[PDB]
Design a protein around this ligand. Structure first.
Ligand SMILES: [Ca+2]
Ligand SMILES: [Ca+2]
Lengths: 918, 131
């Protein structure tokens, strides 16, 4: 129950000291050079040898350099160590650990984007340096300098990203332990009851990466920190330790800290007015990032001499390859979408998983679960899923049920099924070490468990007491795991059961930093140090593949929630921010956290509604529902000591405010699902910060308490302070904005003050958009499946609007073969049209045929033009038929906009149409 | 006579030609607009037999509604619910938001008439005579 500070992490100490030395020496030079005559360029790839000078004799070691220029416009830079590629080192303690630098992070993370640009070309190439042109129309440049090695990445007439400009490149080369630079952290190190045997010695890789002319950087979740990341080298308002990524189970984590949490995505972006760039540091080991805001001059300067403000970052990882992608944008969308091409888009979710999820530690019996389910219906509060935490098990053995408390799990399951609701059951990677437990027998006899430094089976303490851990790095373990989840094997589960993966950092209660020893061995004989941040992801991968098919002929979308994660985990399911606390500061903090998830390419994120630890006041709980309806993943959860707080227990009038928030979420589900579709199509974030939506607006850059929802133009700013009855929203631009609920015109960019009592959600509509909703409330999202849609057409300054709507069966992979509806809606010049979003042509399966009776029935035009007054019909054309529908026009009145409503449109949602107004 | 109308509101569903909204009688409709799945009365009274006025509810997101007693959709509908006559057992109201949702709500609607549109294929039995 204690965490290394940066001084207690030996390689973090060494790398920070490397920086101290470089930054305060007389013209320090990085002792790294390209031997230019080893250099060659062909078919988008530079290759050379970097020679590192390792002492004052001028002795060198060889560090192979690859620079790839990819068809996307992304560059990749990789540096390995030739001695280790060749096995020409010797490990201590007779370790069987691998000698080479871990190089399988690509294979877990990268799924596309790797095609080389044959059109990239050397432009200039003297004996000191070369410049390669690349990217679209050859407008990107990388200047590689030989001696000392550096790279400058350019576009639009300037450097944007520099490698090694401050000279902090550090590859710790292999060296023996001999007798006669401080070496006291090179070998064994001790912390948290444990001693790391360190069989390879020092092997970190680090680099300074400068964002030239950028004042704001973003990313590297997960941290309780602002969206715009802080400096880390001390000073007023700054942190003093670097941001850390080392997935860990951190009990009662605190606010506003660079300390590591449960997952890590080593992806950073930098944004200024109309320019974006980014890097992705692909390394699965413990990683720290120092951030300082500085100037583009390395020297002391004369009075009055100007320098560009520059964010200097210093990245270092315990082991592995130095392996970095460089993204030159120029837009926020460009960066995220290229990142998603490399590491994966958001998986198509089970549609139900966008609804409201009801959980706590624990619902104590099948009867407790059935009672909660009935009470939600009794109090008219919609929900989709109820969740079973660890107490459903028999003595913390996974794949069992406590048959005292959970006597009829199938019956419970069927009750949920009657309203198309689901059940989620927790399954963790620690397998109880006990007898009469076939799962642990098989884990052992198939050799599927994680091992110690000497190859024996690792054993440690978690919820079941003594336990072993599945090694999901091993394909054979993943394939075995798959077998355990078939409905015929995992008795008591059925088609509406899905899975929660927890404790997959991995959390080991008597381990150092509550995790595994660094010298544990995984499949391939990698050390745990090599792969630690990938561990959670391997486990979620295993569970995802298990849910694709759990009986013959089934092929469907998994739902898996994870705690620990890495780059790529967006392909596998959802995350939440772990064990937060029932307090106002944590409510406020949840929004910048969830946003940082999205801009780092894993948007399917949320935080526990109400807070995990403690007991929220009624007003805190109420406001948390109003925030939580904007989390892509929306779940209430509560610690074992917290009082029962199922939402109907709050009492009136809170119950009503809570139900209204739930119903708002449900009514917007068509639009929410469409936002997930775009996340799937090209990694577009689900909720979007102001730097993403409005890159032209400098004042937007740091803002992290408001956001847009997908493609709807809905701008939300939830209330997150105690006792507040107004809210100040930053209006990003000159478009017209309208209150969602009252249609009041909210009164160019600037701060608007709005009324926001407890019962009110601050939600505005931007002009220029169309979004879909479903107005009929229902008990769950499944009972909405066949209901009609309302389109809301929000008109701005230009009398134009556009938007879209994606629908499919929510469950299958039939969308891969075209079995879906995706409409683009355009309003222009008194006409609203619907066309296929991609412009497709023809063959209809069952689901699509059934959608022929599901209609758009209502259209609301907000800001309807005065010319429409007294016209009482519109004309509708679709599929070579024509008819009239009634429209009522409502004039502007007081602060409220004019609005018109078309009634009984009567058009099937899958059909092209044109509606002519005025 | 229109579907979902209880005995004590029967008298309001009568003319030939026009329907006056029961609780908000300054709005008058054509009688073809009863149970046409458009919510045309701001008290909900033109849809006794469908789910289309179920958003007229104090629990649902508030939207402007000219002619509503409150001025918005946050209002108490005139009708108590959708009436299931349940011949052979005993009549009762169910909530409009249980109407045509694909779920047979047999406890209070044993005749199965809540799912008369067969949303998504659903066919409900008439279970009244058994219960
Ligand atoms: Ca009607
Ligand atoms: Ca029903």
């Amino acid at each position: 129950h204690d965490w290394k500070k940066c001084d207690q992490s030996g390689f973090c100490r060494r790398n920070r000291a490397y920086a101290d030395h470089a930054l305060s020496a007389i013209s320090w030079e990085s002792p790294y050079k390209i031997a230019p005559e080893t250099g060659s360029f062909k078919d988008g790839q530079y290759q050379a040898i970097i020679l590192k000078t390792i002492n004052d004799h001028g002795e060198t070691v060889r560090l192979p350099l690859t620079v790839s220029f990819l068809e996307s416009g992304t560059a990749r830079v990789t540096i390995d160590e030739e001695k280790r590629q060749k096995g020409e080192i010797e490990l201590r303690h007779d370790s069987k650990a691998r000698k080479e630098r871990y190089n399988e992070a690509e294979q877990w993370v990268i799924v596309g984007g790797m095609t080389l640009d044959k059109g990239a070309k050397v432009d200039y190439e003297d004996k000191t340096q070369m410049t390669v042109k690349y990217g679209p129309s050859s407008k990107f440049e990388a200047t590689i300098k030989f001696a000392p090695f550096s790279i400058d990445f350019k576009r639009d007439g300037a450097s944007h990203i520099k490698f090694n400009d401050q000279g902090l490149l550090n590859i710790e080369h292999w060296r023996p332990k001999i007798d006669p630079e401080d070496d006291s952290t090179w070998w064994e190190e001790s912390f948290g009851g444990n001693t790391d045997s360190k069989p390879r010695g020092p092997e970190s890789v680090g680099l300074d990466i400068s964002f030239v002319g950028y004042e704001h950087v973003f990313g590297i979740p997960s941290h309780a920190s602002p969206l715009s990341l802080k400096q880390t080298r001390g000073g007023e308002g700054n942190y003093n330790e670097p941001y850390r990524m080392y997935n860990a189970d951190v009990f009662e984590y605190i606010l506003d800290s660079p300390m590591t949490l449960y997952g890590s995505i080593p992806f950073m972006q930098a944004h200024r007015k109309d320019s974006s760039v980014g890097i992705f540091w692909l390394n699965a080991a413990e990683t720290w990032v120092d951030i300082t805001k500085g100037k583009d001059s390395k020297n002391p300067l004369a009075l009055g001499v100007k320098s560009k403000i520059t964010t200097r970052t210093h990245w270092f990882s315990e082991s592995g390859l130095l392996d970095v992608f460089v993204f030159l944008g120029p837009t926020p969308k460009d960066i995220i979408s290229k990142y998603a091409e490399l590491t994966g888009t958001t998986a198509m979710p089970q549609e139900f998983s966008l609804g409201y999820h009801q959980c706590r530690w624990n619902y104590v019996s099948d009867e407790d679960v059935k009672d909660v389910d009935r009470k939600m219906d009794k109090f008219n509060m919609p929900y989709d899923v109820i969740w079973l935490d660890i107490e459903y098990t028999d003595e913390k053995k996974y794949f069992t049920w406590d048959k005292h408390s959970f006597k009829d799990p199938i019956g419970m399951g069927k009750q949920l099924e009657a309203h198309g609701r689901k059940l989620v059951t927790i399954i963790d990677p620690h397998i109880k070490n006990t007898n009469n437990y076939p799962v642990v027998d098989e884990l052992k006899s198939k050799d599927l468990a994680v091992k110690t430094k000497d190859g024996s089976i690792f054993e440690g303490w978690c919820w079941p007491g003594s336990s072993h851990w599945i090694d999901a790095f091993n394909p054979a373990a993943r394939e075995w795991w798959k077998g355990l989840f078939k409905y015929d094997k995992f008795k008591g589960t059925m088609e509406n059961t899905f899975i929660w993966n927890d404790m997959n950092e991995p959390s080991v209660f008597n381990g150092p930093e509550v995790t595994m020893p660094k010298d544990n061995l995984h499949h391939g004989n990698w050390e745990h140090r090599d792969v630690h941040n990938l561990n959670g992801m391997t486990f979620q991968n295993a569970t995802y593949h298990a849910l694709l098919s759990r009986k013959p002929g089934e092929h469907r979308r998994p739902f898996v929630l994870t705690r620990a994660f890495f780059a790529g985990s967006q392909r596998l399911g959802a995350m939440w921010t772990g064990d937060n606390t029932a307090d106002w500061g944590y409510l406020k903090a949840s929004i910048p956290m969830v946003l940082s998830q999205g801009i780092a390419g894993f948007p399917f994120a949320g935080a526990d509604v109400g807070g995990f630890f403690g007991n929220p006041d009624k007003d805190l709980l109420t406001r948390w529902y109003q925030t939580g309806i904007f989390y892509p993943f929306f779940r209430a959860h509560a610690h074992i000591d917290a009082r029962r707080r199922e939402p109907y227990l709050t009492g009136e009038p809170y119950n009503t405010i809570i139900a209204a928030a739930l119903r708002l979420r449900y009514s917007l589900l068509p639009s929410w699902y469409t936002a997930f579709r775009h996340a799937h199509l090209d990694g577009t974030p689900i909720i979007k910060p102001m730097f993403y939506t409005h890159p032209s607006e400098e004042a937007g850059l740091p803002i992290d308490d408001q956001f847009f929802i997908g493609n709807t133009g809905l701008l939300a700013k939830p209330v997150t302070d105690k006792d507040r009855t107004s809210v100040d929203i930053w209006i990003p631009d000159s478009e017209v904005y309208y209150d969602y609920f009252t249609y009041d015109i909210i009164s160019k960019s600037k701060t608007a003050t709005l009324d926001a009592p407890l019962e009110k959600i601050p939600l505005l509509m931007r002009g220029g958009h169309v979004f879909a909703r479903r107005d009929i409330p229902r008990r769950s999202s499944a009972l909405m499946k066949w209901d009609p849609y309302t389109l809301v057409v929000v008109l701005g300054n230009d009398r134009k609007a556009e938007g879209d709507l994606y629908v499919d069966d929510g469950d299958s992979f039939d969308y891969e073969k075209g079995q879906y509806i995706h409409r683009r809606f355009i309003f222009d010049a008194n006409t609203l049209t619907s066309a296929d979003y991609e412009g497709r042509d023809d063959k209809e399966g069952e689901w699509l045929k059934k959608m022929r009776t599901v209609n758009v029935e209502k259209i609301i035009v907000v800001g309807a033009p005065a010319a429409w007054k007294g016209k009482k019909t519109v004309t509708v054309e679709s599929e070579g038929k024509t008819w009239a529908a009634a429209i009522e026009y409502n004039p502007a009145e007081k602060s409220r906009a004019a609005f018109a409503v078309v009634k009984k449109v009567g058009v099937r949602v899958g059909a092209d149409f044109k509606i002519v107004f005025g | 006579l229109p579907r979902g109308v209880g005995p004590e509101f029967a008298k309001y569903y009568t003319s030939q030609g026009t329907f006056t909204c029961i609780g908000t009688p300054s709005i008058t409709l054509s009688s073809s607009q009863i149970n046409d799945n458009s919510c045309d009365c701001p008290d909900g009274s033109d849809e006794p037999g469908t789910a289309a006025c179920a958003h007229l509810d104090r629990l649902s997101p508030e939207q402007p509604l000219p002619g509503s007693l409150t001025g918005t959709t946050n209002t108490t509908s005139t009708l108590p619910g959708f009436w299931c006559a349940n011949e052979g057992h005993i009549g009762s109201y169910i909530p409009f938001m249980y109407v045509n949702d694909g779920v047979c709500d047999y406890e209070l609607c044993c005749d199965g008439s809540d799912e008369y549109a067969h949303a998504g294929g659903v066919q409900c039995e008439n279970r009244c005579a058994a219960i």
